[PDB]
Design a protein around this ligand. Structure first.
Ligand SMILES: CC(=O)N[C@H]1/C(=N/O)O[C@H](CO)[C@@H](O)[C@@H]1O
Length: 421
């Protein structure tokens, strides 16, 4: 409602760097563009099908043994390559992600990492086989290639420990950690995972897994995030979930795929990051394919309100959100990533919501850096003018006031150009 509240909401661009590889530089250009358009965060899937992030030390202790760091890396590379051997690269390094966090911090952009499980973990599944964990995959109408078997303790201990090490790295570097939990063995159930889980009475074990991951996150000072799919499926509460989880809500599903309504989750106390399916772009999707092609995503940045949760009509239904997230996915990871399409889409979201997005502070930052470090040998006339310009700076401006901001920075330049001994 207020100027302050709107700017305090999260405005997030999501990048699926799990299915598909992105260079440090491509990610830095995304954060750049995120900063310029007044976003607050970049949500970066690192484990999503492919596992595209390796820590310097990947030693894992589970199952009463330890798996050598070198073995863990080699296995993961193999797992990720088997999902998709991307010719542009395999995994980002620790040094790369650390630099991306520092860089994003310098531009007032948070990073929100995601490592997906128990679904979307093709690469982890293969890696576990290579490390001597047999049959880690869930098994329904056929053996899953995507999802871990909830009954396999050996696989479960390994993954939990692996997610731990990832969370240890992000602790004190990022505020939020997304553990995902979307799509339970959809490839093995004709996209009816949750129905299969309830049918087999494994849904309770699903919640246990999810609740464990939320507690792990919290223990290490990370806000846990997850997608909506798995929580209180079909609005039933026979099986309980951690209430502290930030729910990234993208859709209520479709016929026979009966996700909890956002009304039901709100009534359970959840906060949402509005990740509306309407805003999805899948790299390379064409009009003729239906779903999230670029021109529909761009049109929806106007048509679907900022605060509208999927399946609800806003403002008739008005549920509290912490902010909204626009998502770029790489379902066919060999599709070409075309920066400008993403930029055009980010820009369109920001342009239709100028009251939510910050102005562009990059020019201001450039100018503040041109301030001399000592500045003790200049006149008092020169410095009074620089004091007054520095004081008149406004960091609270939204995207409707670029001009108002540019003037302020112009005066800072003039005062800096105005100094003299
Ligand atoms: C949370 C989520 O969105 N999960 C999948 C998805 N579910 O509808 O659609 C996207 C685009 O097809 C996929 O890339 C996602 O991995």
């Amino acid at each position: 409602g207020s100027h302050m509240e709107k700017l305090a909401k999260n405005k997030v661009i999501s990048i699926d760097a799990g299915r598909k590889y992105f260079t440090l530089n491509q990610l830095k250009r995304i954060v750049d563009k995120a900063s310029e358009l007044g976003y607050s965060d970049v949500h970066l899937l690192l484990g999503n099908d492919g596992l595209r992030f390796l820590l310097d030390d990947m030693t894992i202790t589970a199952n009463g043994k330890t798996y050598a760091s070198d073995d863990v890396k080699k296995a993961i590379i193999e797992g990720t390559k088997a999902y998709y051997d991307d010719p542009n690269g395999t995994a980002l390094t620790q040094a790369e992600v650390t630099e991306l966090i520092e860089y994003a911090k310098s531009k007032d952009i948070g990073l929100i990492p995601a490592i997906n499980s128990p679904g979307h973990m093709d690469a982890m599944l293969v890696a576990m086989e290579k490390l001597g964990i047999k049959n880690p995959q869930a098994h329904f109408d056929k053996v899953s290639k995507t999802t871990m078997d909830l009954k396999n303790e050996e696989a479960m201990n390994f993954v939990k420990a692996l997610i731990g090490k990832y969370m240890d790295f992000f602790a004190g570097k990022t505020k939020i950690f997304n553990f995902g939990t979307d799509e339970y063995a959809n490839d093995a159930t004709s996209a009816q995972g949750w129905y299969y889980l309830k049918w087999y009475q494994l849904y309770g074990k699903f919640a246990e897994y999810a609740n464990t991951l939320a507690a792990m996150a919290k223990e290490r000072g990370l806000q846990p995030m997850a997608f909506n799919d798995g929580f209180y499926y079909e609005d039933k509460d026979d099986v309980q979930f951690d209430k502290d989880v930030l729910i990234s809500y993208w859709s209520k599903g479709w016929w026979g795929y009966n996700l909890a309504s956002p009304q039901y989750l709100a009534s359970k106390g959840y906060k949402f990051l509005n990740t509306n399916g309407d805003w999805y772009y899948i790299l390379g999707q064409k009009p003729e394919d239906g779903g999230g092609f670029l021109k529909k995503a761009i049109e929806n940045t106007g048509k679907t309100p900022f605060n509208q949760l999927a399946s609800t009509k806003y403002p008739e239904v008005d549920l509290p959100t912490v902010g909204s997230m626009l998502s770029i996915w790489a379902d066919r990871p060999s599709a070409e990533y075309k920066e400008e399409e993403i930029f055009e889409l980010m820009t369109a979201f920001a342009d239709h919501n100028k009251d939510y997005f910050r102005a562009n502070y990059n020019a201001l930052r450039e100018e503040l850096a041109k301030i001399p470090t000592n500045l003790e040998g200049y006149s008092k006339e020169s410095l009074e003018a620089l004091d007054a310009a520095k004081t008149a700076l406004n960091y609270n401006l939204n995207r409707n006031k670029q001009a108002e901001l540019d003037t302020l920075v112009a005066n800072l330049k003039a005062a800096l150009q105005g100094l003299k001994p």
